[PDB]
Design a protein around this ligand. Structure first.
Ligand SMILES: NC(=O)C1=CN([C@@H]2O[C@H](COP(=O)(O)OP(=O)(O)OC[C@H]3O[C@@H](n4cnc5c(N)ncnc54)[C@H](OP(=O)(O)O)[C@@H]3O)[C@@H](O)[C@H]2O)C=CC1
Ligand SMILES: NC(=O)C1=CN([C@@H]2O[C@H](COP(=O)(O)OP(=O)(O)OC[C@H]3O[C@@H](n4cnc5c(N)ncnc54)[C@H](OP(=O)(O)O)[C@@H]3O)[C@@H](O)[C@H]2O)C=CC1
Ligand SMILES: Nc1nc(=O)c2nc(CNc3ccc(C(=O)N[C@@H](CCC(=O)O)C(=O)O)cc3)cnc2[nH]1
Ligand SMILES: Nc1nc(=O)c2nc(CNc3ccc(C(=O)N[C@@H](CCC(=O)O)C(=O)O)cc3)cnc2[nH]1
Ligand SMILES: Nc1nc2[nH]c3cccc(Sc4cccc5ccccc45)c3c2c(=O)[nH]1
Ligand SMILES: Nc1nc2[nH]c3cccc(Sc4cccc5ccccc45)c3c2c(=O)[nH]1
Ligand SMILES: O=c1ccn([C@H]2C[C@H](O)[C@@H](COP(=O)(O)O)O2)c(=O)[nH]1
Ligand SMILES: O=c1ccn([C@H]2C[C@H](O)[C@@H](COP(=O)(O)O)O2)c(=O)[nH]1
Lengths: 491, 510
């Protein structure tokens, strides 16, 4: 006699308002509901919940319907509803479902619900009816029997609303092949793993989490420039979808403002880190101090001057660098402008690359570029995709930031080229985890990911060229991450 | 139901002078032991061999422990074997039969409920007989890639195309290439053909949804299956797009392969690869040479079609002498940023020597994360005959002084160029590793615009019907003479055990 609850709730567990739905229509969510609820099967709903549905849908087809009330033309309680399912319908019924509040709380207090099919609406909406609090609430936001998640899906989106799908539970020729696989596997301590209780791992952040796990379990312990020491692998790959949502990581809060401002910085081709630091974005400071510049044999550099790096190569590749106050307009190659031009005139060209790796300028820069190359790609559906190669990856600190950065860049380019963002492909060379990050990361790996937010470009009508973007033309919608996890930057 | 187990040269050789044709193959021996011994308690396995095989085995190892030993002979007797060495406790007494049917009859008559599997172990006579009777269900074949002097050969059997070029025995298992004592080899298995979590499958059911290379091969350990599956995947899921050349293309974006370099060399075997080409062109790169004619008059015409007067003009470069590729690949490698003139100019000391940089950094500071070589220089692109495809490579060293290399390729002609590139940068990795006193571990292939040309699709479809052969071994000769990257010549290499399929004609998209 098992029972399952099927729901769609906000992070604040809101499910309704004015006897209806808080959010605009969620197509994929409805397909999910309709598919899950049938394989006949039975659905049980409250009095008002039956009224919430349009008349043309009210008899939920191919499923035994059970309204519970004491007024209408149908059981008088949830236990009665179950009894009606046990006595008759004992044959032909498979599993049961419960689909409003009070019925949910009845099912929970009576402790009959074994599994929870929750649709995590990432956005909050005005509500007057909420899903009851329960052990496992951690899966919605940062608020003995307990509900452990087992299924976490890819982030979907409809009408500007991002959401997830999670499932919770209460807590001859092979024989011939076998003995060879045996000895081949034999040769060759305790494997760590991102939230192992989750068997069906559809969320794209599991790429990152499993990357961390794989590096900790299968990497080599090495030294480096910083003297901190790392655990590293070589040649790693991720890729994040961009059509439904935005890969702003959720297992820890990512410095979005930092991402955005640093990217706008890059695009302007600014090499002055003080412009970043004065906006509260001080990700560059420790690498543009007098001490570090002097360690780089650059005593003639002003504090803040990152030299001819990243942006300067982007907009003025091969140009002679003076200082962070010099106007380099017209000089060098404008890789960004060329990439955009070729995108807008001839998208089938396979030479649409932007490089930051200039051997003739390396020694002149504060830090050699990590993300040193990106390449763009269009298909027949006007869908833009971007590959970014990274020579060196601080998995704990820098990688999420980079994902966000180049995904954002892809969004912007896609907008100014009348293209639809599709995918960001992340290619990584030296992929390493700093030894003084390991424990914090092991803390992070116990966190189940939340729905990806969607990033909207505001004032699209006003924005026609890549230079036209400002720090106020973006909104981050439906971002519900775990708490910040502090990690010191190995200088 | 009997299984045969063998080790074999491409020309089906298995022995010489009542011994093995090759040096000791330890992993092959481990394979043999584990295959012939492992039982799920009560029963043991039986091994049946000919007299000469028994005599070929060393005294200490015979009879094969924990296995019932049956010898087919007419001259030998059971007491001949019994008086050869005292039977150890717990072991079975060695039996002697006058034929294979006699062996099997014995096995059924007084070893039922006693033995599990029956393995024919050698030699040519027993293999021949076993194939004649049709009792052989599976063949455990250890394909040795090198050819050796042999006076005894495994018989000809339908489906022996898994050895060399020409009811059936089709492969179901093909492993990665191992190597011992300069001998490359792999293992294949032929077959005679002629509400815990379950309640969550419905959500999987609505999130759930043609061409495949050699689908009968269930275990696909061979690393060439990366390439084959890459082809099949591009064909099935790729998008048909227009193209710079006018020929149609089917493309995907963001593709990954990686090949091992510690055991053998990834010179693709499902078609013959122009090794002379990859070698000469790589040396050509290292010299910083921009003169395609130097490649052409050595028999490597791979650049001609892109350095013709016509093409050079279509590139808006009438000033270029025929054959001058401009400031590309090698030129950026050895002289990045240097001002170009022509292919006859001396450039020593000009620009950045990325190769020497990388090598020195490898020899002195192997944990540096800036070991890169790039040929993508936006300034000199319009001066080049063709913008670099393999445009960037990065190196890596770990615990055990092992070198790994990633190469990023913006554009990838899968059918034509990709194998050549693989071979190329794998070779580069070998050379660099030798020059830096390191062990080659891995070449990693990162691919941007990955595509096949529409005039190649039929040929690739043809190519996917071929199961791969053991990877060869690329030996560096005259190591003592070679101390620097420039010290290499064309005769300092040796491809060993390369047994590829026939060439497949595919015209270059101009
Ligand atoms: N987002 C989502 O997934 C879903 C949202 N909703 C939303 O929820 C709201 C409807 O839920 P809610 O307003 O809580 O009302 P319900 O639809 O759950 O029904 C409440 C009525 O059902 C009867 N009832 C419920 N529980 C019991 C009980 N334990 N014993 C006896 N009778 C019971 C009572 O009828 P009587 O007075 O006749 O005794 C009561 O007035 C709407 O806003 C709806 O749109 C609904 C379903 C799913
Ligand atoms: N690489 C590999 O996988 C293997 C290689 N080898 C090599 O092969 C060589 C030995 O093979 P080979 O020379 O063919 O010798 P075999 O091992 O086949 O032995 C031949 C002898 O066995 C008896 N015999 C074999 N078949 C029959 C039959 N059908 N009917 C009756 N009697 C039979 C006869 O014994 P009698 O004369 O006593 O009557 C015959 O002289 C050696 O070089 C060995 O090292 C062997 C096994 C595996
Ligand atoms: N995850 C979840 N999402 C929901 O929207 C939801 N809604 C309810 C109650 N509201 C409704 C409103 C309309 C229909 C409905 O018309 N269903 C049809 C159409 C499915 C479709 O549009 O594809 C059905 O036959 O399933 C169902 C439930 C209960 N549990 C839920 N659970
Ligand atoms: N695949 C294959 N490889 C072989 O070398 C081979 N050799 C023979 C005949 N020659 C020999 C000679 C010695 C031993 C031997 O001593 N074998 C040990 C393996 C040692 C180990 O455990 O690694 C055994 O116990 O089987 C076996 C076969 C027959 N079939 C073969 N089949
Ligand atoms: N070891 C190491 N060095 C780094 N240098 C950086 C320069 C700019 C951004 C970055 S990435 C970054 C991204 C987000 C937050 C950060 C906070 C402090 C320091 C760096 C942050 C780095 C960076 C890094 O992430 N790790
Ligand atoms: N469509 C297409 N155009 C190409 N132009 C090239 C210029 C240099 C090498 C190459 S790739 C290549 C490189 C070296 C040898 C080859 C031998 C036969 C076929 C291709 C070879 C190309 C090339 C290509 O592979 N495909
Ligand atoms: O965007 C960035 C910038 C820096 N880093 C990290 C990677 C390396 O830890 C370090 C650079 O040091 P070298 O690779 O230059 O030695 O900074 C990133 O992951 N992403
Ligand atoms: O080493 C090489 C050189 C060239 N090409 C192919 C890729 C493209 O199909 C073709 C033409 O170049 P673009 O149109 O991508 O420039 O050359 C390779 O695959 N590998």
């Amino acid at each position: 006699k098992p029972v399952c609850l099927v729901v769609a709730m906000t992070p604040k567990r809101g499910i309704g308002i004015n006897n209806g739905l808080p959010w605009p229509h969620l197509t994929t969510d409805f397909k999910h509901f309709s598919r899950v609820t049938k394989t006949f099967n039975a659905v049980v709903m409250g009095r008002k919940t039956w009224e919430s549905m349009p008349r043309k849908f009210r008899p939920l087809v191919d499923r035994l319907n059970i309204v519970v009330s004491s007024s209408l033309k149908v059981c008088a309680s949830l236990p009665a509803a179950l009894s009606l399912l046990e006595e008759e319908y004992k044959d032909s019924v498979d599993q049961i479902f419960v689909v409003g509040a009070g019925l949910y709380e009845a099912a929970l207090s009576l402790g009959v619900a074994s599994h929870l099919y929750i649709t995590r609406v990432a956005r909050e909406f005005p509500c007057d009816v909420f899903f009851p609090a329960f052990p496992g609430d951690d899966i919605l936001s940062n608020k003995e029997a307990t509900y452990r998640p087992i299924f976490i899906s890819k982030t979907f989106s409809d009408n500007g609303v991002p959401y997830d799908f999670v499932v919770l539970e209460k807590r001859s020729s092979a024989a011939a092949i076998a003995p060879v696989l045996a000895w081949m596997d034999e040769e060759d301590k305790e494997l760590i793993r991102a939230v192992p209780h989750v068997h069906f791992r559809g969320h794209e952040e599991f790429q990152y989490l499993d990357l961390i796990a794989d590096i900790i379990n299968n990497g080599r312990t090495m030294d480096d420039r910083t003297g901190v020491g790392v655990i590293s692998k070589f040649g790693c790959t991720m890729r994040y979808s961009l059509d439904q949502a935005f890969p702003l990581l959720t297992t820890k809060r990512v410095f979005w403002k930092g991402v955005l401002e640093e990217l706008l910085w890059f695009i302007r081709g600014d090499t002055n880190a003080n412009h970043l630091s004065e906006k509260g974005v001080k990700i560059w400071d420790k690498n543009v101090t007098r001490e570090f510049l002097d360690s780089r044999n650059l005593p003639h550099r002003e504090v803040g001057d990152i030299g001819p790096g990243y942006g300067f190569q982007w907009r003025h590749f091969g140009a002679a660098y003076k200082d962070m106050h010099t106007d380099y307009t017209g000089q060098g190659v404008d890789q960004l402008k060329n990439v955009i031009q070729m995108l807008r005139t001839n998208p089938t060209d396979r030479r649409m690359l932007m490089t930051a790796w200039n051997p003739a300028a390396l020694d002149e820069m504060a830090l050699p570029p990590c993300h040193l190359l990106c390449q763009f790609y269009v298909n027949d559906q006007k869908e833009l995709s971007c590959i970014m190669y990274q020579r060196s990856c601080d998995v704990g600190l820098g990688v999420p930031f980079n994902i966000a950065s180049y995904s954002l860049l892809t969004l912007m380019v896609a907008h100014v080229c009348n293209l639809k963002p599709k995918e960001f492909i992340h290619f990584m060379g030296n992929t390493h985890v700093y030894t003084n990050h390991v424990e914090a990361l092991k803390e992070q790996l116990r966190r189940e990911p939340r729905p990806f937010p969607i990033v909207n470009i505001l004032n699209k009508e006003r924005i026609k060229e890549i230079d036209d973007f400002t720090a106020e033309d973006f909104e981050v919608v439906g971002y519900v991450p775990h708490g910040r996890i502090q990690m010191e930057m190995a200088v």
